[PDB]
Amino acid sequence: ANRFTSNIKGLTQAARNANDGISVAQTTEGALSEINNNLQRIRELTVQAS
Amino acid sequence: ANRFTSNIKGLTQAARNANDGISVAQTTEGALSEINNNLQRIRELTVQAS
């Protein structure tokens, strides 16, 4: 039962860590999408300047 | 989806550029017509002076 308690506590902590990782990935993806929009605008600008 | 966005927003600007070129062609054709009228008048004056 003691080892089971250890396993359960570790599993909860690992779930917390995974939620934090999901947060990190989403936070990065937001800025990625923004930079993509900027690149699309630059490409249309070059199209007009060509 | 992003590549389709790029292609669409490029083709729209390309159509704009084609219209801007049509404008140049028309503006040139006008002056060409005026010069043609002047040459016709010159030819009539020549056949008068012959």
B17 CB neighbours in chain A (<8 A) are 47-48, 50
Neighbours of B10 (CB within 10 A): 17
Q: Which residues of B touch A43 (CB under 8 A)?
A: 6, 9-10
Structure-solving method: cryo-EM
Best of A44, A45, A46, A50 to mutate (most B CBs within 10 Å, chain B):
A44
At a CB cut-off of 8 Å and minimum separation 6, what does B6 contact? A40, A43
Resolution (A): 3.4
User: Can you read off the two tokens belonging to residue A40?
Assistant: 């699309």
Burial class (CB in 10 A: 0-12, 13-18, 19+), B17: middle
Query: A49 CB near a chain B CB, below 8 Å?
Result: no
Q: What is the Rg, in whole angstroms, of the alpha carbon atoms belonging to chain B?
A: 22
Using CA atoms, how far apart are residues A18 and A11, in angstroms rounded to an integer?
Answer: 10
Which residue from B33, B12, B49 is spatially nearest to A40, judged by alpha carbons? B12
